[PDB]
């Protein structure tokens, strides 16, 4: 069985510098790319920044400075050099697919207290019936062409990917959730709605670029009953 487990998460004052952890299972950090993700409790989802198989970094351009990744041949590493009070978040590590760079193994993420393309996600909350139909559309600054990819997130849970590519859907996920978009207009949407579909969706570029990897600010969606 394949999997991703993060440690190092504390509370810290600031200006304490802290390292985290990233322990992978079942695969060789020698053959996947591993990428860094944070959320703040109650925002949304914000890419750190990713090394390659090959050791190949690449921050986003906010992170520079702030953060420093490394690895081991089991371990992928985060530091962040001075923390404030705005680092205050769970911190995730997440396992890149091969075609883009989006993730398809997330691992349950790590608490750290301490004492340029922008993306456009619409509606920011929408409730419909069992049974109902929610549209959620998602609007990229400049083109990124197929390089989309869809997240499931249940409350204090780490996110599943659903589509990757725009429109190709993830094993497991049922045909319910169909994708459809290209270069700066995409949607997503959930037919015959369930119980199980209560959580916050998230769009990502998963464009090949540090400046161009960006994720949606996030659509709760409900179920009316």
């Known amino acids: 069985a394949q999997s991703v487990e993060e440690s190092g998460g504390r509370l810290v004052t600031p200006g304490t510098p802290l390292t985290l952890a990233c322990t992978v299972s079942?695969?060789?950090?020698?053959?996947?790319?591993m990428f860094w993700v944070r959320q703040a409790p109650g925002k949304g989802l914000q890419w750190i920044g990713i090394i390659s198989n090959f050791g190949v970094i690449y921050y986003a351009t906010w992170a520079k400075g702030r953060f420093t990744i490394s690895k081991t041949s089991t371990t992928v590493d985060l530091k962040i050099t001075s923390p404030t009070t705005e680092d205050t978040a769970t911190y995730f590590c997440?396992?890149?697919?091969?075609?883009?760079?989006?993730?398809?193994?997330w691992g349950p993420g790590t608490l750290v207290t301490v004492s340029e393309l922008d993306m456009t996600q619409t509606p920011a909350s929408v409730s419909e019936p069992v049974g109902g139909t929610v549209t959620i559309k998602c609007q990229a600054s400049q083109s990124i062409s197929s390089y989309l990819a869809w997240y499931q997130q249940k409350p204090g849970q780490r996110p599943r990917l659903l589509i990757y590519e725009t429109s190709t859907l993830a094993s497991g996920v049922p045909s319910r959730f169909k994708g459809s978009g290209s270069g700066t207009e995409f949607t997503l949407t959930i037919s015959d709605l369930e119980c199980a579909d209560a959580a916050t969706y998230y769009c990502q570029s998963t464009y090949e670029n540090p400046t161009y990897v960006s994720f949606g600010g996030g659509t709760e969606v409900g179920v009316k009953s």
């Open positions: 079942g695969f060789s950090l020698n053959t996947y790319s």
């Open positions: 997440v396992r890149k697919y091969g075609s883009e760079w989006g993730g398809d193994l």
